[PDB]
């Protein structure tokens, strides 16, 4: 809880890739706080407008140091705006242009922190980001504990030759291999839900699941469109032991960077000059696993 400060921070696109950062702060116990500090860090590969800063600094009530001003666009990822005061009658709001100068993937949330000079503990910190809002990193929590969802949606992508499948499913902790019909797709905001019914166990393991039984699969919301699954349809699924969720007999599975999810064409739909190869190979994959069993 932000005991002594309300902090509201937004990032919005400009009316290579510049943006508008808006900082809205005010303080609790309605006589204005004295000298206060706004400590701002940038999104990886962003820098403020030298002008907008000089603009902010020159209007009295606020101070931005010469040392911060003489800094280069080359390396200015932190920044401190000093405020002569901040009450709560309203919100004291400011905004400046942040320019991207280094196009790298992912990009890390920025952060804003407020406090008065004479007490650092009593502070408020909000994180900002374009594709996440409120800046929170993709985690996946139930009850008490989280998992880092910031990672690949599932073993990624074109040729998928028989070796490539037969090989990749005998690595470290490949604990299960199922053919699955998808029985219900319980969407939601925070985390998705895919009830897969196990059509057969190709490789069993750390979970004695019987054929006909259903198992829930969780996946982050930001993966929804990339997985793009639909009910009634069959699948192929790798997965590890470190991917489970909750105690026996109620063991939920998680889809992460290490899981293989593959669309399996239906029985009659196999006979098509576009699904010819995949159907044969997925069929070949099964028998090699059943009759032989990873010749490790």
């Amino acid at each position: 809880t932000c005991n002594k400060f309300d902090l509201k921070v937004t990032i919005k696109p400009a009316p290579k890739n510049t943006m508008i950062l808006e900082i809205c702060t005010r303080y609790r116990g309605d006589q204005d706080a004295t000298m206060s500090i706004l400590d701002i860090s940038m999104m990886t590969g962003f820098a403020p407008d030298t002008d907008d800063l000089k603009q902010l600094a020159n209007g009295v009530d606020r101070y931005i140091s010469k040392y911060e001003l003489d800094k280069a666009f080359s390396d200015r990822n932190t920044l401190i705006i000093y405020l002569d005061k901040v009450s709560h009658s309203e919100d004291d709001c400011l905004a400046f242009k942040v320019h991207q100068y280094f196009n790298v993937e992912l990009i890390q949330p920025g952060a804003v922190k407020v406090y008065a000079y004479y007490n650092l503990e009593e502070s408020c910190t909000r994180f900002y980001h374009p594709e996440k809002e409120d800046g929170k990193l993709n985690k996946l929590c139930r009850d008490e504990l989280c998992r880092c969802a910031e990672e690949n949606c599932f073993i990624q992508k074109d040729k998928v030759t028989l070796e490539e499948r037969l090989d990749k499913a005998c690595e470290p902790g490949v604990d299960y291999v199922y053919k699955t019909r998808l029985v219900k797709v319980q969407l939601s905001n925070d985390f998705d839900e895919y009830i897969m019914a196990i059509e057969q166990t190709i490789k069993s393991g750390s979970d004695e699941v019987q054929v006909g039984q259903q198992r829930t699969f969780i996946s982050p919301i930001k993966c929804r469109e990339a997985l793009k699954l639909e009910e009634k349809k069959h699948y192929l699924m790798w997965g590890l032991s470190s991917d489970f969720w909750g105690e026996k007999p109620n063991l939920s599975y998680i889809i992460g960077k290490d899981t293989w999810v593959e669309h399996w064409p239906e029985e009659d739909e196999c006979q098509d000059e576009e699904n010819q190869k995949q159907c044969q190979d997925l069929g070949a994959f099964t028998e090699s696993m059943v009759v032989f069993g990873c010749p490790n």
């Binding site: 860090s41 390396d75 990822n77 890390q108 952060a111 910190t125 880092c148 910031e150």
Partner: protein
């Protein structure tokens, strides 16, 4: 990359006691002008700071004597200062700065900094993709590098960051603990 020390070959400074050399000797070696001399060999810890060494002596004939403080400064041209807080709450997001310093008198340095990955922390660092920036630090100057993390496990957990400079055999690592607290 080219002309930079590999991440695996960088050994991270880790021993950061607030206090040490809590330690006893007797001046046994025979006197020379009433004065005995001991030579103590020590290993200095990893902190980049100034140790204030203090000695008290107790003597049958001469009693109790408190030496004057003698300071030792431990120092490097290039190094990281990982600035962690004392505790962090579980599943709450925090920023932590990893400041980089440069004291070469007339030379800037290309540096590749990096946050390491840990199962106990959620951050852009994952087991198969590194989380490295590449910054330029002007001479007689420092740079903050902000890393955002989310603490998952409880108890005493470890944040660690490394840095290597381009075109020089210079580099540093730091491994500090912080405390993870339940809800």
């Amino acid at each position: 990359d080219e002309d930079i020390i590999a991440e695996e070959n960088i050994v991270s400074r880790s021993e950061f006691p607030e206090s040490w050399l809590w330690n006893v000797e007797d001046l046994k070696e025979p006197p020379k002008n009433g004065i005995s001399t001991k030579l103590m060999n020590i290993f200095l810890k990893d902190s980049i700071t100034t140790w204030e060494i203090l000695a008290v002596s107790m003597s049958d004939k001469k009693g109790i004597c408190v030496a004057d403080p003698f300071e030792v400064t431990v120092m490097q041209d290039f190094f990281i200062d990982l600035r962690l807080p004392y505790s962090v709450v579980r599943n709450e997001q925090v920023e932590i700065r990893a400041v980089l310093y440069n004291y070469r008198q007339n030379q800037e340095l290309k540096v590749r900094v990096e946050l390491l990955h840990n199962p106990a922390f959620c951050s852009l660092a994952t087991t198969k993709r590194r989380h490295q920036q590449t910054v330029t630090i002007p001479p007689k100057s420092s740079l903050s590098v902000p890393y955002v993390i989310v603490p998952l496990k409880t108890g005493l957990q470890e944040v660690e960051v490394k840095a290597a400079v381009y075109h020089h055999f210079i580099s540093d690592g730091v491994r500090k603990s912080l405390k993870v607290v339940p809800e």
